[PDB]
Design a binder for these strands. Sequence first.
DNA 1: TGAGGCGTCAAC
DNA 2: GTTGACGCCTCA
Length: 59
Amino acid sequence: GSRRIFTPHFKLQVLESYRNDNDCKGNQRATARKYNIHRRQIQKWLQCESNLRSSVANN
DNA sequence: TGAGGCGTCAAC
DNA sequence: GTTGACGCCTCA
């Protein structure tokens, strides 16, 4: 239904939290819940997180 | 019973 | 055309 405006920094913020936040680190549902987003997007961004990095032009 | 992975469609 | 949103199957 929706397509909100997701920034790579946010995506990477999700992914970064997802990867280090003691609250979601290692879990996709928890990060999506904490960030109030879908858990398919974390998984999908992962399918291109490397691309997210070059997209934000940092790290 | 609860968590992780992939595909297709409409809006961006 | 690609990305945000949604479901079914399998493992411990």
